[PDB]
Amino acid sequence: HMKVYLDNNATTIVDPEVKAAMDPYFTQIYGNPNSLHDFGTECHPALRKAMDQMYEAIGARDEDDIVVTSCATESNNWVLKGVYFDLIKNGDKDHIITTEVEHPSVTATCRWLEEQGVRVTYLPVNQDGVVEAHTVRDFITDKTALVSIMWANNETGAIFPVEEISEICKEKGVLFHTDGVQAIGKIPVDVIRAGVDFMSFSAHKFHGPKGVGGLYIRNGHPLTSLLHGGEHMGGRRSGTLNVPGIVGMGKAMELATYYLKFEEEHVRKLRDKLEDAILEIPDTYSVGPRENRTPNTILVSVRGVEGEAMLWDLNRAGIAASTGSACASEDLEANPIMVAVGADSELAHTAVRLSLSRFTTEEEIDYTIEQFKKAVERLRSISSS
Amino acid sequence: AHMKVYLDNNATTIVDPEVKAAMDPYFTQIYGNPNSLHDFGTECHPALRKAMDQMYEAIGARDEDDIVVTSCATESNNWVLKGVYFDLIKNGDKDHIITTEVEHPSVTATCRWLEEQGVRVTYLPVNQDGVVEAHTVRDFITDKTALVSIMWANNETGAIFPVEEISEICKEKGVLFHTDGVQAIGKIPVDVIRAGVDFMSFSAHKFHGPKGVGGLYIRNGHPLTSLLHGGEHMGGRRSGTLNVPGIVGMGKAMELATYYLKFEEEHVRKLRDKLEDAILEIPDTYSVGPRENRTPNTILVSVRGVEGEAMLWDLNRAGIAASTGSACASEDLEANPIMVAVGADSELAHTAVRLSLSRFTTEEEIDYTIEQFKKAVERLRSISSSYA
């Protein structure tokens, strides 16, 4: 029996060196950075180094702004509700474009905004689990305020063509926000090559602590504060700084870009080994093309078995994984495949999501393969066909 | 001379080594998402349950009430103000909020933005004793008042507001009552039912908890439109992955704060009174606010000849951390010169030195601060051409 964590898309372990970087800023270094005395300013070089690491990690420039939030949920709420306030309730706009596969912090916010008179089109997702740039350009009107498309999906790992969406969005002169939580540490992130106006991210996705996130803004574009008050974060988000959170997030983001620049094959090779091994089981289908998928993600549908049952038989074996919505369909060759769908569909079935990280060992993978085979055989023997 | 001494506790506090020890496992040892169904995710569930229990017991909340964990009391204040505006003003029949001129910027600036959306706001001035009394709030409530938001205790003077009577008046008039209780936890007894409040904001890093975590208490699970929408974290009232270390730390810190409350009432109050008496032995010095209505750990002293910012800077050169506080010159009923609390945006305001202790303050630190304070006053009065 071995405990194995493959739910990294939900949360990640804090790198011990990141935790060590955070350690002094609880009891040793505790002053408020907004104070003028030496106790308050003692953490200022650490905050500056952290902010520099974040700017460097995402390819932001000096002109741009990076506001530290409590989580990417805050960031999504902030950009959606602030653009609604700026260009819809006090502007001449009334439309937002997004996808039916976004994180709940975007979907539920969009539904509340629709409860405030905003027209929102949740764009359906194509066979590859992606939304393409021509659909969105066909859906931009003269009243569209904002296009909000996640950078990569958390259930399938599919990468969205955020750059092409940016080109079109700039053509129509509409702001572009992306939920980039799944991008940091897994794919190259250059927010000027992506052309996005706003980007949300979360530290606990790339081995930073929980309780700290960020929102990126291009060229300090105006965005009404979600949290008003004091002049923390350039007067854009009030409240005492989560000093350990900031220090840790910066260290984690630097480490994420280092391990993507060199440790890129270790995670990708283990993901592909696991996926090949699982796909050698009869009547298994992996959702989404691997060549457009983050290196750490598999979303597998097992026929005969149900995703929750597969999840709990894995959990009994010490393996943590999660669920993902999928729909039954075919390709152009008329071969049955499993494809992405919004969770709120009736044609969705639960597939098993397995997400690795840079801390996954090959032994963990051998154990996971063996236990996956075991669970599949035991459970197909007890149900349906 | 130089000794580092921290007397700016009303701004932020050191994390109790026990709170840090309670937090340590929940970064790398226990890291699963509490919203997951596998054992990795649920492993932290008992710590969250225990922390939530610690909070409810610490503030005297009941089982019906809700305690939603926020990122900071700034979040809580923004949430309560903007949510009541959404519920009872934009989609209701109210348009008035009553508050004070001495609120934290989290509430003042929010109120000004609400005024920018058509909300009538009355910033009630604060009296000589540095407090707003219940009868004036009653005089200002109409049948359009949606919410009364008055801080529990002031962060510059430490003056305690009569939140119980204000609640009584609010309940007679049937208007919701929110308090910024950040300054109350660890310094005064906090029972949110005896205070009669409908909403209360608090922040962990004020009572020796970590930065990045706060809370909002809600009576009886009163409806309040979410500031952060999404998943159903915190009963669907505040989305976003739980700050597990922050929650555990906040629970431990709140338990410690209520335990140490009598240490703070006795010993810390004794050290505060020593420092304040010693400082008041200097000619032309005035303590803002009556002590018999003040949190045990706070002094706001106005010096006549010296300027507050200069006094802060050379005190810091001596290793002493303190802060500023707004004050206005006045007289008492006997026509004796006194310094009284005033909003920061007044032009009749000058800077007084704020000194705030904690349960970690030593009598050596107090003695050193007394000596260095006297030195700085003498030094800066010795350079004045005006002072006499």
Whether B102 is in a domain gets the answer yes
Residues B127 and B9 in one domain: no
Number of Cβ within a 10 Å radius of residue A318 = 17
Record: contact A211-B14, CB cut-off 8 A: no
Chain A positions touching B213 (Cβ under 8 A) are 211
Q: What is each CA distance from A44 to A36, A40, A48, B373, in whole angstroms?
A: 11, 8, 6, 27
The C-alpha of B43 sits at a distance from chain A's nearest C-alpha, in angstroms, of 12
CB-CB under 8 Å, B213 with A320 = no
Tokens of B385: 């051409």
Chosen domain end from B198, B228, B260: B260
Q: How far apart are CA A131 and CA A165, in angstroms?
A: 9
Contact yes or no for A81/A106 (Cβ under 8 A): no
**CATH number of the domain that residue A295 is part of:** 3.90.1150.10
Q: What is the DSSP string of A250-310?
A: HHHHHHHHHHHHSTHHHHHHHHHHHHHHHHTSTTEEESS-GGGB-TTEEEEEESSS-HHHH
The two counts, helices (H) then strands (E), for chain A are: 12, 14
C-alpha distances in Å from residue B56, one per residue of B18, B87, B159, B166, B388: 20, 26, 25, 22, 54
For residues B32 and B125, membership in a common domain is answered with: yes
Total domains, chain A: 2
Check if the beta carbon of residue B149 is closer than 8 Å to that of residue B97.
yes
Mark yes or no for CB contact A30/B15 under 8 Å: yes
Q: Is A195 on the interface with B (CB under 8 A)?
A: no
Q: Are residues A72 and A165 in the same domain?
A: yes
A309 within some domain: yes
Q: Count, in order, helices (H) and strands (E) of chain B.
A: 12, 14
The radius of gyration of chain B from alpha carbons, rounded to an integer in Å, stands at 22
For residue B382, tell me if it sits in a domain. Answer: no
Q: CA-CA distance, B237 to B226, in Å (whole number)?
A: 5
Chain A CB contacts of B230 below 8 Å: 73, 76-77, 103-109
The reply to whether B358 touches chain A by the CB within 8 Å rule is: no
- Residue A141 CB burial class (10 angstroms; 0-12, 13-18, ≥19): middle
Q: What is the DSSP string of A256-272?
A: HHHHHHSTHHHHHHHHH
A203 three-class SS: helix
Structural domain containing residue A151: 15-259
> By the 8 A CB rule, do B183 and B203 touch?
no
| Alpha carbon distance B158, B352 (integer Å) | 13
Nearest CA to A322 out of A298, A304, A296 is that of A298
Handedness of CA A318, A324, A327, A333 (dihedral sign): negative
SS3 A87: helix
A226 and A267 both lie in a single domain: no
Task: Count how many pairs of residues, chain A against chain B, have C-beta atoms within 8 Å.
Answer: 211
For residue B75, give the nearest of A32, A76, A239 by CB distance. A239
- How far apart, in Å, are the Cα atoms of B47 and each of A172, B71, B248? 50, 18, 6
DSSP code string of B167-199: HHHHHHHT-EEEEE-TTTTTTS---TTTTT-SE
Q: Please work out, in degrees rounded to the nearest 5, the angle formed at the alpha carbon of residue B219 by the alpha carbons of B97 and B60.
A: 120
Would the CB atoms of A228 and B41 count as touching at under 8 Å?
Answer: no
- B310 and chain A: CB distance < 8 Å anywhere? no
Which SS3 state, helix, strand or coil, does residue B35 take?
A: coil
| DSSP-derived 3-state class of residue A241 | coil
Q: Is residue A380 part of a domain?
A: no
- Does A382 reside within a domain? no
Q: Which of B260, B277, B292 is the last residue of a domain?
A: B260
B244 touches chain A (CB under 8 A): yes
CB atoms near residue A369 (< 10 Å): 17
In angstroms, rounded to a whole number, what is the distance separating the alpha carbons of residues A100 and B8?
A: 49
Alpha carbons B265 and B68: distance in angstroms, whole number: 29
Q: B125 to chain A nearest CA, in Å?
A: 19
Alpha-carbon distances, residue A11 vs A62, A154, A202, A320 (angstroms): 30, 11, 10, 11
- The DSSP annotation for B223-240 comes to ----SS-SS-GGGGTS-S
The Cα B333–Cα B365 span in angstroms is: 36
φ/ψ region of B234 (left if φ > 0, alpha if ψ in -120 to 50, else beta) reads: left
CA distance B280 to chain A (A): 23
Nearest in space to A77 (alpha carbons), one of A192, A213, A209, A204: A213
The nearest CA of chain B is from the CA of A331 a distance in Å of: 33
Question: Could you tell me if A1 lies within 8 Å of chain B, comparing CB atoms?
Answer: no
Question: What resolution in angstroms, rounded to 1 decimal?
Answer: 3.1
Does B269 share its domain with B250? Answer: no
Q: Which of A152, A147, A131, A128 is nearest to A205 (CA)?
A: A152
* CB of B17 closer than 8 Å to CB of B210: no
Considering the domain architecture, whether residues B96 and B229 belong to the same structural domain is answered as yes
Taking each helix axis as running N to C, give the angle between helix B73-84 and helix B105-115, from 0 to 180 degrees, rounded to the nearest 10.
30
The two three-digit tokens of residue A366, written as one number: 């051998």
Q: Find the radius of gyration of the CA atoms of chain A.
A: 22
Closest Cα in chain A to B15: A27
Q: Which amino acid is at B46?
A: P
d(C-alpha A341, C-alpha A63), whole Å: 38
Distance CA B192, CA A172 (A): 53
* Co-location of B173 and B284 in the same domain: no
Residues of A in contact with B239 (CB under 8 A): 73, 77, 104-105, 108
Residue B388, in any domain of the structure? no
Q: Using CA atoms, how far apart are residues B61 and A113, in angstroms rounded to an integer? A: 33
The verdict on B11 and B45 lying in the same domain is no
CATH number at residue A159: 3.40.640.10
At B353 the three-state DSSP class reads strand
Does A384 fall in a domain?
Answer: no
Which residue of chain A comes nearest to B70, CA vs CA? A70
Cβ within 8 Å, pair B31-A37: no
Q: Are residues B151 and B296 in the same domain?
A: no
3 state DSSP class of A193: coil
Instruction: Tell me, yes or no, whether A245 and A272 share the same domain.
Output: no
DSSP state of B385: S
Q: B74, A38: Cβ pair inside 8 Å?
A: no
| Domain end (from B219, B244, B260) | B260
Q: Would you call B5 an interface residue with chain A, using a CB distance cutoff of 8 Å?
A: no
Give dist(CA A299, CA A154) in Å, integer.
10
For residue B384, tell me if it sits in a domain: no
Question: Which two three-digit tokens encode residue A197?
Answer: 């106006």
Distance between CA atoms of residues B317 and A107, nearest Å: 53
Residue B326 tokens read as 């707004």
Distance of CA B156 to CAs B67, B121, B184, B349, Å?
Answer: 27, 23, 13, 13
Q: Does A273 touch chain B (CB under 8 A)?
A: no
Q: Where are the alpha helices (DSSP H) in chain B?
A: 17-23, 25-28, 39-42, 45-59, 73-84, 105-115, 134-140, 163-173, 244-263, 269-280, 308-317, 363-381
Query: Is B78's Cβ below 8 Å from some Cβ in A?
Result: yes
Q: Are residues B8 and B110 in the same domain?
A: no
Whether residues A99 and A246 share a domain: the answer is: yes
Helix (H, G, I), strand (E, B) or coil at A315: helix
